[PDB]
């Protein structure tokens, strides 16, 4: 399949992105507790359900949240000022809650089965969100960092395996502050900084110029 995008809603971020996040990879967000991560995964799981004329694939969604920090009525707003019709636009997106790290693994290989059957279909999985990716490793294993990363490289190979096998951007958010961060070290596809700036703006660079952008009522915009 060729390389699709997904525009984030900024024109800005997407200029840094290239046009916006890539199917067949990994983009993984990183920055402090507020710095707007869930955001930018909400305002992504509105925008891949546009047409490509306006930067979406007319795509599905699947969403994996570890901090039960998904709205429902967040996307109803996103969408509703982004010109779809917000009961449309919720029941595209596939909603799971990972109670551990073991389970969030388990929820990827079951991720699989509902992108084999919406594959051939108008509106097939084209996004899969995990937020917080890192956040039950990270407490789970407290004191125990090689078997986190061999749990963690596992994972992040399962959710690549997908990206490139079923044409499917995946987007990760990973809290990282005041000395925390092996970020995801190498694995993602693309690693995007995210930090709060004055005034609210928020402020993007790529890991490996500078996006910035305001939330808003239509998600993330200029
Ligand atoms: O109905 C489902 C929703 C999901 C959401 C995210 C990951 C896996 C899921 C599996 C489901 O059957």
Excluded: C
């Excluded at 079951?110 to 279909?121: H, R, S, V, Y």
């Excluded at 996004?127 to 039950?136: A, G, M, P, Q």
């Amino acid at each position: 399949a060729t390389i699709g995008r997904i525009s984030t809603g900024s024109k800005s971020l997407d200029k840094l992105l290239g046009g916006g996040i890539e199917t067949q990879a990994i983009t993984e967000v990183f920055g402090e507790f507020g710095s707007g991560k869930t955001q930018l995964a909400h305002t992504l799981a509105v925008m891949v359900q546009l047409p490509p004329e306006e930067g979406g694939l007319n795509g599905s969604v699947m969403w994996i949240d570890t901090e039960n920090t998904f709205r429902p009525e967040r996307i109803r707003e996103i969408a509703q000022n982004r010109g779809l019709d917000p009961d449309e636009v919720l029941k595209h997106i596939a909603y799971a809650r990972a109670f551990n790290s073991n389970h969030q693994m388990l929820l990827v290989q079951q991720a699989e089965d509902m992108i084999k059957e919406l594959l051939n279909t108008d509106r097939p999985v084209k996004l899969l969100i995990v937020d917080s990716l890192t956040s039950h490793f990270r407490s789970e294993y407290i004191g125990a960092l090689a078997e986190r990363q061999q749990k963690l490289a596992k994972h992040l190979a399962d959710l690549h395996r997908l990206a490139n096998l079923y044409d499917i951007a995946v987007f990760v958010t990973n809290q990282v502050q005041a000395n925390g961060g092996h970020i995801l070290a190498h694995s993602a596809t693309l690693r995007v900084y995210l930090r709060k700036g004055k005034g609210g703006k928020r402020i993007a660079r790529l890991i490996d110029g500078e996006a910035v952008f305001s939330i808003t009522e239509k998600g993330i915009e200029d």
